[model samples]
Target: MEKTHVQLSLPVLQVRDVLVRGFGDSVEEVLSEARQHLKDGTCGLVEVEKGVLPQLEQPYVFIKRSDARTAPHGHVMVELVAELEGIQYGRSGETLGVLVPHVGEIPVAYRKVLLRKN
Candidate 1:
C-alpha cells in the first residue's frame, strides 16, 4: 500500500523528544541519517525485548532488562532508560519513552525495548 501515513514507533517519538529537548529538533535529521547507518550494518536490531547491545559504535537498538545478550562489551551510546506502554508477553502496540539518550559512560543498561524483525 503506497501511503503517506503510517504509525511510527513510540520509542522513536520518545527519542525524538529527548533530542528536541537538547539539540533543538536536529536529532530528527540525525535519526533519519542514523537509519542509513542501520542499513549499512553500523547498528542492528536485537532479537529480544531486553539485553545488552553487544557492540560499540552501535547506538541503534531496542532492549529491556536482561532478556538477551550480545558482544563482549565496549564504549557506546552507553545507556537507555525507556518508559514502556502497550507491551506484554505476546501482544501488539508497544511504545517507549526515551528516558535516556544515547551518549557516553562505560556501557549502558537499557530497558523498555523491542526486538523483532522489521
Candidate 2:
C-alpha cells in the first residue's frame, strides 16, 4: 500500500445544538424543511410555527427526529413541550410569562444504509 491522502464525503449529517421550530400540528412540514437545512449543512436549523393556542408562546421550538443510541431509524414524531417563565410581574396584579421549548437530542442518519457505522 502507498501513502494515500484522500477525503471522504459521507452521506450522514452530524450536528448538534440545532434550533428547530415547528407547529404542533404541522410536524410533517417542519420535518421536510428541516431535512433540507440539514442537507445544506446548516446544522439542522428548523423553524417551527406555533399552534392556535394562547396558553403558550415562543419564537421557536426544538425538535428531535432521530438518535443513533435510540431510535436510529428516525421513526419518531416531533415532540414539543413548552417551558415557561414569568417575565412580567407587577403590583397591579398582572403576570406574563415567556414560553420556550427545550432542546431535544437529535442525531442525523442517512436515508438508507447497509449497516450502522461505529
Candidate 3:
C-alpha cells in the first residue's frame, strides 16, 4: 500500500435556492435556460418559495421544479398551472387569483458555475 497526499484544481458549480422567475408563454425559454445551466435530469431540481401566503400580491410567483418527481415529507407538491386565468372575485374580493406575467428583466436570481478545464 502507498500513501498519497495530492491536491487538484477543479472548476465546479453546485448551488441551490436558485430562483427561476415568473411563468409566462415563454416557459420554454425559462425551461431551456435552466436546463442549459443546471445539471437537469442529473442535478437537483429548483424550488419555489410559495411566499407571502394569502397576501398573494408577491411581485413574483415562484416555480418549484425538482429532479425528484415527488416532494419530500412535510412539503407539498406545487404543480405547474396556468400563470393567469380569469379572476373570479368573491363578494368581498377574497378569492380566485392567479399570477400575471413577470417583468423578466429581473434575473430571478444570481448565477455562476465551475469545472476543470479539459
> Number of the top candidate by TM-score?
2
Candidate 3, backbone clash total: 5
lDDT of 1 by residue, 1-118 (tens): 5232212122222222222122112333334443443334333222222432222122232322322342123211122222223222222332232222323222223332232322
lDDT: worst 10-residue window of model 1: 75-84
Cα-based lDDT for every prediction:
0.28, 0.28, 0.26
How do the candidates rank by lDDT, highest first? 2, 1, 3
What TM-score does each of the candidates earn?
0.22, 0.23, 0.22
| Alpha carbon deviation, residue 39, candidate 2 (Å) | 0.7
Q: State in Å the error of residue 74, model 3.
A: 18
Model 1 spans > 4 angstroms off: 1-30, 33-92, 105-108, 115-118
- Residue 52 in candidate 1 has what lDDT? 27
Please state the error at residue 91 of candidate 1 in Å: 16
Q: What is the alpha-carbon lDDT for the whole of candidate 2? A: 0.28
